[PDB]
Amino acid sequence: MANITVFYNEDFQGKQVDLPPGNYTRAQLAALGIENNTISSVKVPPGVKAILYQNDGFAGDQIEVVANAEELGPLNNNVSSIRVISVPVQPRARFFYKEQFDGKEVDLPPGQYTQAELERYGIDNNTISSVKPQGLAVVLFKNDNFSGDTLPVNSDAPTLGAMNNNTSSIRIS
Numbered sequence: 579m580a581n582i583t584v585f586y587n588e589d590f591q592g593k594q595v596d597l598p599p600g601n602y603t604r605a606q607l608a609a610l611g612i613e614n615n616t617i618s619s620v621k622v623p624p625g626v627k628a629i630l631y632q633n634d635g636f637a638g639d640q641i642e643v644v645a646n647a648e649e650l651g652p653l654n655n656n657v658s659s660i661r662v663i664s665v666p667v668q669p670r671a672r673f674f675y676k677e678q679f680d681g682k683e684v685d686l687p688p689g690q691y692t693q694a695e696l697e698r699y700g701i702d703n704n705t706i707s708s709v710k711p712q713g714l715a716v717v718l719f720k721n722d723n724f725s726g727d728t729l730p731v732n733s734d735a736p737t738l739g740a741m742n743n744n745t746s747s748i749r750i751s
């Protein structure tokens with residue numbers, strides 16, 4: 579079983595609400611109570627992929643996630659339509675906050691990421707640090723689109739903090 583859990587305030591903070599998978603709009607939500615600008619943050623575990631839609635009727639800027647979205651995105655100022663569909667379970671990785679696995683963690687499924695969603699998809703510009711792959715290998719790229727120097731994390735690294743300069747793009751192999 580699965581269920582996406584949103585948050586009322588940004589930063590994963592603010593009252594939360596669990597919503598079962600499937601496709602719905604402001605209609606179903608009207609039945610619950612939450613609607614419009616409220617999904618400030620999001621926590622979606624693996625096994626199921628979620629897709630948000632700003633304007634109702636599944637329209638307006640759309641988002642896609644499978645893990646826990648911290649900052650969510652820029653359109654967090656308006657939400658109502660969403661769509662989630664069961665997805666095959668796959669391993670992933672885990673990044674901590676404070677330098678020394680002493681800060682909230684964030685997971686990210688396999689795949690590549692840029693410098694825009696990545697940050698606003700799990701953490702932010704600079705704040706990752708200590709990393710810990712829960713199954714696959716993580717690779718950090720300094721410059722944008724996986725370019726410039728790189729820090730291939732082919733193993734556990736509960737302590738990186740001051741190392742490069744600012745992880746821009748990444749790739750979980």
Ligand SMILES: [Ca+2]
Binds near residue numbers: 588589649
């Ligand atoms: Ca925010």
Ligand SMILES: [Ca+2]
Binds near residue numbers: 677678737738739740
């Ligand atoms: Ca350290």
